[PDB]
């Protein structure tokens, strides 16, 4: 009782204990009530040594965290304020878990379909704690591709009306800020059994198309549950590179498991790209309307705060897997409501309301530029002349903006509107689409997993037609909070980036990508294309110039500002 037990942010770590003698600072005197007094603020530790006598190891004291404090408590407040929880999870669903030394048995193998000589691969933005998709492409005897996109096995594991399936659906999705995330289940599910890690057998959910180059199925589809052993694990920044020509040595420094070559990888891969170069052409010629929203991307340091920021860029990688999880999306969505017409989950996409619609139209006047709105085609026809007006800075905000014009999608159970037509989804330009290749960070796909192995095992939905709204209703609410909580993250991330620049030289961070639009003084409305995200200034300028500005910022913890001045 002459120590101090200091409890890591980071779970993986054990407690380390520090003496009475070594909290630095602050110690000695009354010590039991110095660390009280600080019983809130962050510290640093630096273990020392682990005696094979004690429990827990020991350390030395650092420095106080006021700054990582001040961060990890607006992110607490933030959480609260949107109606996240973000706790342990309880013992009731830590025990519908399956046991940690759970692995795929031989009469499990027996009842699936055998992949784990096949082809697979992941590919990821590099970051994040998930792995539930995998892609895959054969080439036939014919001229022909056996493709398919196989995803973690998350509703073998939760079972339906459990108390890890009733926490799950509470969450109805996983929160994703700069510095974690806020798991929609355990860990044993994200990092084990329903993570598609290279070189390991995991159980999956699979679906077949028998594709051609120009992208059209001149085979039955095929749907059911498989055993495969992913190869490769790539990320865009590397899958990127195989398919503008690099090597498989340069942008992939990475070795390859089972049989397959580096050769044997970057044609299934180059093949991927092509289809996915029709698949896509196939799509804006039915109406689709792919713009592009703007996020951050940061790197953080040592102690966690942000030491880099970018404006993240899509790239033909992303757009190569997006295309064929749209597609299993598509094709698991028109088997279920065809199987299921009345308790089946899917999703939808309105045109948009004239309050955000012909209000958008407007302000595309105001720089003189007409918008065509009549129909889909209309809105990405608009949106291709646009790019070729105006700026590729611009470009990044003018999308942005686009995207708030455009009504949001929403799930909705098939039973509530009984006319298809009702069903359509204005930006992708489908007439059947749901979410099926995310169940370990959504819960709706958690129960169309479960309604497509319904309808082939030939039962019924198992779900009902109240209880499907319910799901519906509130995982497009709490996905509400988790969209605003995410970008309000991300916004904090760039107040702390900007503050923790001029900290570690002086005053303000100095940008030079802002511009113009418009009104309203003593007020200029500004965009900072650098960064994105617009902003406010209160010897002459005018809307669609360009200039630099300042960039301000104070933070934490019940606050965070970004302000510019001239």
């Given at each position: 009782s002459s120590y101090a037990i200091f409890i890591p942010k980071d779970k993986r770590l054990p407690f380390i204990t520090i003496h009475k003698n070594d909290l630095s600072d602050l110690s000695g005197e009354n010590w039991i009530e110095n660390i009280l007094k600080h019983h809130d603020q962050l510290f640093s530790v630096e273990i020392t040594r682990w005696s094979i006598y004690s429990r827990w190891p020991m350390g030395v004291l650092g420095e106080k965290l006021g700054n990582i404090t001040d961060v990890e408590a607006y992110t607490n407040a933030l959480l609260l304020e949107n109606g996240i929880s973000s706790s342990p999870f309880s013992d009731e669903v830590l025990n519908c878990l399956p046991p940690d030394d759970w692995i795929i048995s031989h009469e499990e193998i027996k009842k699936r379909r055998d992949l784990r000589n096949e082809l697979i691969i992941t590919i990821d933005p590099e970051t994040a704690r998930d792995l539930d998709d995998a892609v895959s492409c054969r080439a036939l005897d014919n001229g022909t591709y056996e493709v398919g996109?196989?995803?973690a096995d998350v509703t073998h594991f939760v079972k339906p009306d459990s108390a890890l399936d009733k926490e799950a659906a509470s969450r109805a999705t996983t929160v994703y800020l700069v510095q974690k995330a806020i798991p929609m289940l355990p860990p044993l599910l994200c990092e084990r059994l329903c993570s598609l890690n290279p070189?390991?057998?995991?159980?999956?959910?699979?679906?077949?198309?028998?594709?051609?180059?120009?992208?059209?199925?001149?085979?039955?589809?095929?749907?059911?549950?498989?055993?495969?052993?992913?190869?490769?694990?790539?990320?865009?920044?590397?899958?990127?590179?195989?398919?503008?020509?690099?090597?498989?040595?340069?942008?992939?420094?990475?070795?390859?498991?089972?049989?397959?070559?580096?050769?044997?990888?970057?044609?299934?891969?180059?093949?991927?790209?092509?289809?996915?170069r029709k698949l896509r052409k196939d799509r804006f010629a039915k109406g689709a309307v792919e713009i592009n929203?703007?996020?951050?991307?940061?790197?953080?340091?040592?102690?966690?705060?942000?030491?880099?920021?970018?404006?993240?860029?899509?790239?033909?990688?992303?757009?190569?897997?997006?295309?064929?999880?749209?597609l299993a999306n598509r094709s698991v969505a028109?088997?279920?409501?065809?199987?299921?017409?009345?308790?089946?989950?899917?999703?939808?996409?309105?045109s948009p309301k004239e309050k955000q619609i012909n209000e958008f139209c407007h302000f595309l006047k105001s720089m003189n530029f007409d918008f065509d709105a009549s129909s889909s085609a209309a809105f990405n026809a608009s949106m291709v002349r646009l790019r070729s007006t105006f700026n590729e800075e611009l470009v990044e905000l003018f999308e942005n903006m686009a995207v708030r014009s455009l009504n949001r999608?929403?799930?909705?159970?098939?039973?509530?509107?009984?006319?298809?037509?009702?069903?359509?989804?204005?930006?992708?330009?489908?007439?059947?689409?749901?979410?099926?290749?995310?169940?370990?960070?959504?819960?709706?796909?958690?129960?169309?997993?479960?309604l497509l192995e319904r309808s082939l095992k030939n039962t019924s939905p198992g779900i009902d037609?109240?209880?499907?709204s319910l799901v519906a209703a509130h995982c497009n609410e709490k996905k509400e909070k988790s969209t605003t909580v995410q970008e309000d993250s991300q916004q904090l991330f760039l107040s702390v980036y900007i503050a923790e620049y001029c900290k570690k030289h002086d005053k303000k961070s100095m940008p030079v990508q802002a511009f113009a639009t418009r009104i309203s003084g003593?007020?200029?409305?500004?965009?900072?294309?650098?960064?994105?995200?617009?902003?406010r200034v209160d010897k002459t300028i005018a809307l669609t110039d360009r200039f630099q500005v300042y960039l301000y910022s104070d933070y934490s913890r019940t606050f965070f500002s970004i302000r510019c001045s001239l």
């Amino acid at each position: 009782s002459s120590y101090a037990i200091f409890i890591p942010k980071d779970k993986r770590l054990p407690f380390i204990t520090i003496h009475k003698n070594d909290l630095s600072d602050l110690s000695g005197e009354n010590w039991i009530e110095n660390i009280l007094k600080h019983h809130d603020q962050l510290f640093s530790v630096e273990i020392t040594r682990w005696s094979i006598y004690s429990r827990w190891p020991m350390g030395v004291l650092g420095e106080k965290l006021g700054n990582i404090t001040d961060v990890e408590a607006y992110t607490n407040a933030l959480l609260l304020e949107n109606g996240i929880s973000s706790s342990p999870f309880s013992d009731e669903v830590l025990n519908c878990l399956p046991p940690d030394d759970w692995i795929i048995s031989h009469e499990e193998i027996k009842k699936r379909r055998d992949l784990r000589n096949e082809l697979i691969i992941t590919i990821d933005p590099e970051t994040a704690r998930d792995l539930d998709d995998a892609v895959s492409c054969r080439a036939l005897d014919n001229g022909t591709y056996e493709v398919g996109v196989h995803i973690a096995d998350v509703t073998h594991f939760v079972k339906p009306d459990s108390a890890l399936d009733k926490e799950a659906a509470s969450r109805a999705t996983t929160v994703y800020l700069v510095q974690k995330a806020i798991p929609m289940l355990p860990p044993l599910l994200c990092e084990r059994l329903c993570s598609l890690n290279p070189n390991v057998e995991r159980l999956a959910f699979s679906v077949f198309w028998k594709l051609d180059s120009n992208g059209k199925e001149i085979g039955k589809r095929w749907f059911g549950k498989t055993v495969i052993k992913t190869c490769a694990r790539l990320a865009y920044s590397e899958a990127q590179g195989v398919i503008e020509g690099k090597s498989w040595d340069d942008a992939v420094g990475k070795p390859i498991g089972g049989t397959h070559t580096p050769k044997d990888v970057e044609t299934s891969i180059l093949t991927l790209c092509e289809i996915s170069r029709k698949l896509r052409k196939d799509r804006f010629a039915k109406g689709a309307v792919e713009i592009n929203s703007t996020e951050l991307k940061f790197q953080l340091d040592e102690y966690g705060m942000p030491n880099k920021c970018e404006v993240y860029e899509q790239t033909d990688a992303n757009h190569l897997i997006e295309e064929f999880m749209l597609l299993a999306n598509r094709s698991v969505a028109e088997h279920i409501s065809k199987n299921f017409s009345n308790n089946s989950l899917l999703r939808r996409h309105a045109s948009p309301k004239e309050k955000q619609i012909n209000e958008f139209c407007h302000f595309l006047k105001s720089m003189n530029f007409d918008f065509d709105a009549s129909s889909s085609a209309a809105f990405n026809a608009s949106m291709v002349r646009l790019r070729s007006t105006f700026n590729e800075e611009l470009v990044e905000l003018f999308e942005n903006m686009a995207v708030r014009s455009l009504n949001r999608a929403e799930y909705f159970c098939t039973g509530d509107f009984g006319e298809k037509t009702d069903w359509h989804h204005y930006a992708l330009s489908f007439n059947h689409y749901t979410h099926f290749t995310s169940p370990i960070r959504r819960y709706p796909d958690i129960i169309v997993h479960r309604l497509l192995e319904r309808s082939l095992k030939n039962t019924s939905p198992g779900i009902d037609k109240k209880n499907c709204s319910l799901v519906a209703a509130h995982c497009n609410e709490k996905k509400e909070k988790s969209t605003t909580v995410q970008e309000d993250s991300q916004q904090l991330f760039l107040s702390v980036y900007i503050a923790e620049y001029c900290k570690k030289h002086d005053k303000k961070s100095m940008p030079v990508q802002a511009f113009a639009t418009r009104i309203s003084g003593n007020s200029i409305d500004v965009y900072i294309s650098e960064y994105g995200i617009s902003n406010r200034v209160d010897k002459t300028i005018a809307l669609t110039d360009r200039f630099q500005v300042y960039l301000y910022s104070d933070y934490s913890r019940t606050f965070f500002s970004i302000r510019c001045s001239l």
